[PDB]
C-alpha cells in the first residue's frame with residue numbers, strides 16, 4: 455500500500471495473507487474471508503501455481519513476523535478460478551480458495567459481507583484498501599498490515615485514465631486524481647472494503663494498475679457485486 459498507515463490488530467479481521475511454499479515460503483497475495491471455508495482473492499495470484507498443496511492461508515495476522523514454522527494456517531483443498539479469466543487487465547480476476555478446515559470466527563478472524571444486488575445502486579464514500587504490499591514500485595513486503603482510504607471512481611472517469619484498455623462494469627476503480635494513495639505489489643487479491651450503514655462490504659478485490667499511486671491512474675479492482683451469483687454458485691453447490 456502506498457501512502458498508507460499501520461493498521462491496528464483486528465481492524466480488518468477478514469484480511470488474510472496467502473503464502474506459497476514454492477520454492478521457499480513467502481507471502482503470495484492478500485485475500486478475504488467470506489465464509490467459514492472460503493477465501494475470496496484474485497485469479498492472477500495463481501499464475502504458475504500447479505497445486506493447492508503449496509498454499510498456506512494465515513488469518514488473524516497483523517504482522518508478517520507472527521508467521522514462523524509453528525504458526526497455524528489453513529490448508530487449501532481447492533483453487534477455483536473464474537473460467538472466463540485470461541488476465542487481470544481483461545477482468546474476471548477472481549478466485550475462491552476452499553479451505554481444508556473450517557475457520558473458527560472470533561474478534562481476530564471473521565467474514566466480510568459481500569455486497570447486495572440492491573446495493574449496486576449505492577455510492578460508497580468510506581472505502582479502504584489494505585495489505586502487506588510495497589510502499590513504492592521498488593520496495594519490499596511490509597511487516598505490518600497497511601491501510602489507505604481511497605475514493606471510488608466512475609467507470610467513465612476510469613476509462614478516460616486507461617486509454618488502450620477496456621474498463622468494463624465488472625471492474626471498479628479507486629484513487630485520487632493527484633495519486634498518492636493506492637495498492638501496490640503484494641497487495642493483490644486483498645479487499646477494497648467499504649463501510650455502508652455501519653456494515654463493511656467487500657466492494658473490490660485489488661487487481662491491477664499502471665504503476666502505483668500515480669496521478670490519474672486509479673487502482674483497478676474486480677467489482678465484487680458483479681460476481682455475487684458466481685460466488686454463490688461455487689460456494690452453495692448442491
Ligand SMILES: COC(=O)Nc1ccc2c(c1)N[C@@H](C(=O)OC)CCCC[C@H](NC(=O)/C=C/c1cc(Cl)ccc1-n1cnnn1)c1ncc-2[nH]1
Nearest residue numbers: 480481482595637638639640641642661662663665673674
Ligand atoms: C517475501 O515475499 C515477497 O516478496 N512476496 C511477493 C512480493 C511481490 C509480489 C508477490 C509476492 N506476488 C506475486 C508473486 O509471488 O510473484 C512471483 C504474484 C502476483 C503478481 C501481481 C501482483 N500485483 C499486485 O500485488 C498489485 C498490483 C496493483 C494493483 C492496483 Cl489496484 C494498483 C496498482 C498495482 N500495481 C502496479 N504495479 N504494481 N502494483 C504483484 N506484483 C508483485 C507481487 N505481487
